[PDB]
Amino acid sequence: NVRFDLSSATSSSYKTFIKNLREALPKDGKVYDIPVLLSTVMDSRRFILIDLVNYDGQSITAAIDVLNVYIVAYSTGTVSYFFQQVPAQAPKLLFKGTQQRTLPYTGNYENLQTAAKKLRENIELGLPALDSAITTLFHYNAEAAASALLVLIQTTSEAARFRYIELQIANNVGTKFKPSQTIISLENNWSALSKQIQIAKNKNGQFETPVILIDPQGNRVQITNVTSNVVTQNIQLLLNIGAT
Numbered sequence: 001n002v003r004f005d006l007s008s009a010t011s012s013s014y015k016t017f018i019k020n021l022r023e024a025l026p027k028d029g030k031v032y033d034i035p036v037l038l039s040t041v042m043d044s045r046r047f048i049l050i051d052l053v054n055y056d057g058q059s060i061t062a063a064i065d066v067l068n069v070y071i072v073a074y075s076t077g078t079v080s081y082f083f084q085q086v087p088a089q090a091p092k093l094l095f096k097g098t099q100q101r102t103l104p105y106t107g108n109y110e111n112l113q114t115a116a117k118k119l120r121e122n123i124e125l126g127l128p129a130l131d132s133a134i135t136t137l138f139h140y141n142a143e144a145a146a147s148a149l150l151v152l153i154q155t156t157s158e159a160a161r162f163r164y165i166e167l168q169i170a171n172n173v174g175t176k177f178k179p180s181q182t183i184i185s186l187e188n189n190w191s192a193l194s195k196q197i198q199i200a201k202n203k204n205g206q207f208e209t210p211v212i213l214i215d216p217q218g219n220r221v222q223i224t225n226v227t228s229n230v231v232t233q234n235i236q237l238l239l240n241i242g243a244t
C-alpha cells in the first residue's frame with residue numbers, strides 16, 4: 001500500500017506521498033492537462049488502500065473509492081469502520097477478516113461537522129494533527145472520531161485534489177494551523193470546478209456557470225474560464241462529468 005509514516009516525515013516526503021496517492025488512481029485521460037477520474041470501474045479495481053503511521057509506529061489503513069477520492073472506510077488491522085451510505089460492494093471487498101463496524105454518520109462534511117460538533121475551520125491541520133488523528137482512530141472513541149476523520153480526509157483526499165492544500169499541509173510539518181476560507185472554498189467547489197472545466201473544453205475555455213472562490217487574501221473571486229490560477233496551477237484531479 002502507498003504509505004506515509006510520521007517517523008521520517010518531511011515536507012518532501014509528504015509531497016511524495018500525495019504524488020503517489022494521485023498516481024495510484026486510474027485516469028480517463030486529461031482535460032487542460034488535468035487528470036480526469038474514471039466514470040465507472042470493475043469492482044476488483046474500485047478501491048485503493050493507503051497506510052498512515054503515527055510517531056509511535058501504529059498504523060491505520062484507509063480505503064479510497066477511485067472514482068471520487070472519497071475515504072469509505074478504515075482499518076486498525078483487526079477492526080474496520082465503514083461510513084454510512086458507502087458503495088454497497090465496499091464491505092464485501094475490503095478488510096475481509098476484520099470485525100466490520102459502521103460509523104454513525106456519512107463521510108460528507110455536513111454530517112461529519114454535526115458529529116464533531118464543530119466546523120472544519122475550528123479543527124487543526126498539519127502533520128502533528130495527523131499524528132493525533134491516527135492515534136484517535138487506532139484507539140477508536142466514538143465522540144472523538146469525527147474530528148479525526150475530518151483531519152484525515154483533508155490531509156489525503158483534499159491534498160490529492162488541490163496543490164494549494166497539499167502545500168499548506170507540507171508547510172506545517174512541526175506546527176498546526178486551522179484551514180482558511182481559501183482552503184474551505186476549494187473543498188466545497190471541487191465538483192463544480194470539475195464540471196465547468198470539462199464543459200469548457202467544448203466552449204473555447206469558457207465556463208457555462210461561474211464558480212465563486214475565496215482568494216488567499218480573503219477576497220471573493222469569480223472564476224469564469226480555464227486561464228485562472230485555480231485551473232492552471234492548483235487543481236490536480238477532476239471528478240468525471242458523469243458524476244457532477
Ligand SMILES: *[C@@H]1O[C@H](CO)[C@@H](O[C@@H]2O[C@H](CO)[C@@H](O[C@@H]3O[C@H](CO[C@H]4O[C@H](CO)[C@@H](O)[C@H](O)[C@@H]4O)[C@@H](O)[C@H](O[C@H]4O[C@H](CO)[C@@H](O)[C@H](O)[C@@H]4O)[C@@H]3O[C@@H]3OC[C@@H](O)[C@H](O)[C@H]3O)[C@H](O)[C@H]2NC(C)=O)[C@H](O)[C@H]1NC(C)=O
Pocket residue numbers: 215219220221224225226227228
Ligand atoms: C478569463 O478570466 C480572467 C479572470 O481571471 C479574465 O481576467 C481577469 O479578470 C479579473 C476580474 O475582473 C481581473 O481582476 C481584477 O482587476 C481589477 C483591476 O486591477 C488592476 O487595476 C487596479 C487599479 O484599478 C490595481 O489596483 C491592480 O493592482 C491591477 O493593476 C481589480 O480592481 C479587481 O479587484 C477588485 O476586486 C477584488 C476582489 O476580488 C478586491 O480585492 C479589490 O479591492 C477590487 O475591489 C480584480 O483584481 C483581482 O482581485 C482579486 C485578486 O485575487 C486578484 O489577484 C486580482 O487580480 C484581472 O485583472 C483579469 N486578469 C487579466 C490577466 O486580465 C480574462 O479576461 C478571461 N480570459 C479569457 C476570457 O480568455
